[PDB]
Specification:
CATH class: Alpha Beta
Protein name: Golgi-associated plant pathogenesis-related protein 1
Subunit structure: Homodimer. Interacts with CAV1.
Oligomer: monomer
Distance between the termini: 34 Å
Family: Belongs to the CRISP family.
Strand order of the largest sheet: 1-3-4-2
Helix content: 25-40%
CATH architecture: 3-Layer(aba) Sandwich
Order of helices and strands: HEHEHHEEH
Strand content: 15-25%
CATH superfamily: CAP
CATH topology: Pathogenesis-related Protein p14a
GO biological process, one term: positive regulation of ERK1 and ERK2 cascade
Number of helices: 5
Membrane topology: Lipid-anchor
Structural class: alpha+beta
Radius of gyration: 15 Å
Shape: globular
Amino acid sequence: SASKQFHNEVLKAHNEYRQKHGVPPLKLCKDLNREAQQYSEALASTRILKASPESSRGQCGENLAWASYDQTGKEVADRWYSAIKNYNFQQPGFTSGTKAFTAMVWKNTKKMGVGKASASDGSSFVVARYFPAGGVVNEGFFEENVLPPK
């Protein structure tokens, strides 16, 4: 299906970048797909483009993406990865402008899910969920989980 293709494309792109950053692949998780899909549908209804409540996604991280057209899996992953531009490997740690990249490559994250919903205006809202959550702000965590590119 279109949904299965989109999931696989997002995952394959994540795993390419994870290999470049020396960490193991992610696997897709059906329940994470379903929760991501649910939030993508909420976004396509309300258009309120901001992170879901933490309480709604026990222990998961999140990435979001929007465009005025139907987004491909590769596009979404490449655009999240591009946040690497703001990351300084000599100063490991959380910043908002790098979260989309650090979530993708976080060593200890094992599984992901992704969803996408169209709005009536033709735009699409995409949500990815990561388990266990990455980017936890604790001394040593970023240096151990966000590795430089090969």
